[PDB]
From a paper:
Hit optimization of the scaffold represented by compounds 1 and 3 was guided by crystal structures of these inhibitors bound to [name]. As their common hydantoin scaffold showed excellent hydrogen-bonding complementarity to the active site, this chemotype was maintained. Variations in the S1 and S2 pockets were explored systematically in several cycles to identify the optimal combination of substituents. Combining the spiro-indanyl moiety of compound 3 with a pyridine in the S1 pocket (compound 13) did not improve the potency compared to the virtual screening hit, but the predicted binding mode of this inhibitor was supported by crystallography.
Numbering used by the authors:
A (entry chain AAA), B (entry chain AAA): 1 to 305
The structure:
Amino acid sequence: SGFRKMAFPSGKVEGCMVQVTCGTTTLNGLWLDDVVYCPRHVICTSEDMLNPNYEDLLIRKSNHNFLVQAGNVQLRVIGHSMQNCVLKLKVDTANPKTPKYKFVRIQPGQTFSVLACYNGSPSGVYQCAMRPNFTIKGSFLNGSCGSVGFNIDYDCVSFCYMHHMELPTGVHAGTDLEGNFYGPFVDRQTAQAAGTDTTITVNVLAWLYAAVINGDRWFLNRFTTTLNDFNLVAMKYNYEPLTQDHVDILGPLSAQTGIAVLDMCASLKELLQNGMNGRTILGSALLEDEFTPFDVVRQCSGVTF
Amino acid sequence: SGFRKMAFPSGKVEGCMVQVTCGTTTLNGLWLDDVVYCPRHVICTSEDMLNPNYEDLLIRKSNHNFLVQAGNVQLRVIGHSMQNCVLKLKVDTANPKTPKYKFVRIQPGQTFSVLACYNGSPSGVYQCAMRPNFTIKGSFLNGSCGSVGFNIDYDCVSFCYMHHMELPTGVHAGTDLEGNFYGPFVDRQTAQAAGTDTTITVNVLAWLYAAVINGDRWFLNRFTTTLNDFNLVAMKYNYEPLTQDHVDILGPLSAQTGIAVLDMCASLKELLQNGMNGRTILGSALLEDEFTPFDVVRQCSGVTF
Ligand SMILES: O=C1N[C@]2(CCc3ccccc32)C(=O)N1c1cncc(F)c1
Ligand SMILES: O=C1N[C@]2(CCc3ccccc32)C(=O)N1c1cncc(F)c1
């Protein structure tokens, strides 16, 4: 027992990280088969960043201007393309450490692990959620661009995020691996509105199920609610509306625990309206929304990769 | 910027995990050079666990009774020894994936990453602290025994923890890699007192420095305190007493931020006495004690491995 914010083991991703340098800019790239993926802003200088003309900047570059190094080994670049906000550098050697992988574009409210890297070298791994407003709340310093987010299922890494930018508000934005930003963001040094975020209701409920499974149960009550009444409360407290598709995804946890989804909703309603009264749940003094129902089931059943 | 509970990248450890089976018991082992380390309780059955005579149990076993499998490859066991609460199985092949490593016995209040594994296969990685009472608050299911905790410095993995037991209270206990338990615990199915825990004061202060560095600063105040006055407050609130050695370890963060250690203590005093008043710090609604001052500096400066 116990319940922790757990990241996927990072080794399969560590073997894919490289350093990419173009002129004076160094950031991270991802080497899969004979292609390295990295943020296109590797080609800018500081004069460029307020509104770069990436097509003109890239026309000034040739294959030999992209320095790609995998630990101590230098890769030979034999082609370059820009796809949306990523560059794709074709190299003459397939990465021998390429895992089975896919590129996925995740939905808001889903979670993934981030392998934070600098200069091509891994620093740390942590779990986090794509916010409803398509930002992430990560830990990224200058040099972390090109660090990636991923999930693993069996032996297959699904890459879902590449880090590009810190907004002036301190939150993070990035792309899928086809270079399309999550959210309205653009790769330029401007203030950019993220727009209203909400709490991920289905994930809070999953975490309360994890709490009961672990024996933290003080917040269960004698009450029930309806999906309509709960959603009135959700709106007042800037929670995502709960839908029947959400109720259905919580089915396994409801079955495991015997606590009907709408009964758990009535526990959550009371927590929203009354607070935690100075108490904690699974070590937290707030309602946690970065565990999906699948996360909870996986951790509670010890699934491996 | 941003600040997250970050684990070390786990790849160097993933390459060392194996499954060890003795009779009907399967748990995890750690294969370094030509030795596999695992909990000695792999040799017990359920009849044994209330008070096993490990010396008699191990005398009934021979090399060929220890089944060791590294993914799909079977290892040949050519010797076996018990050291304290660990078994050491000598194998005929050195692990080709052995990293540079050391065995360390950590101090209470220090942190490390855990690679949770089942049947020799990694499940997830998370960070956590050795509590002052020598327990850890992990996420471990049946089958996780033999999972290890570690830190990495440059290219060198320091293994500090091997998981053995969940206490009836739901918290976790284990050994160093020489098989000596942290704390008063024994490897038998009995209720066992952990004794009084406290909050790790030097780590709370480091985290408040991390918060200021990140711009969460609402808790800074106009006050100062003395080490003696602060320690009176620490005692009332079951915090570890702060010593000058602690003040000295916080030196770099004090220098970085310009906030004297005793001034940060006066912020902490006010938080202990008044609470957080419904506010958060670095996403948390409680005072966080699982980041060491070294953790904070590393994460704030993007150190890699
Ligand atoms: O390295 C850079 N470069 C920036 C400057 C502003 C900018 C605009 C477009 C693209 C990239 C960049 C940026 O946001 N980051 C950064 C990322 N994460 C964490 C950080 F601390 C900094
Ligand atoms: O696998 C086992 N086996 C136990 C039973 C009781 C016991 C006593 C001595 C040694 C070992 C064991 C034990 O504590 N765990 C366990 C560990 N972590 C998380 C869990 F959920 C269970």
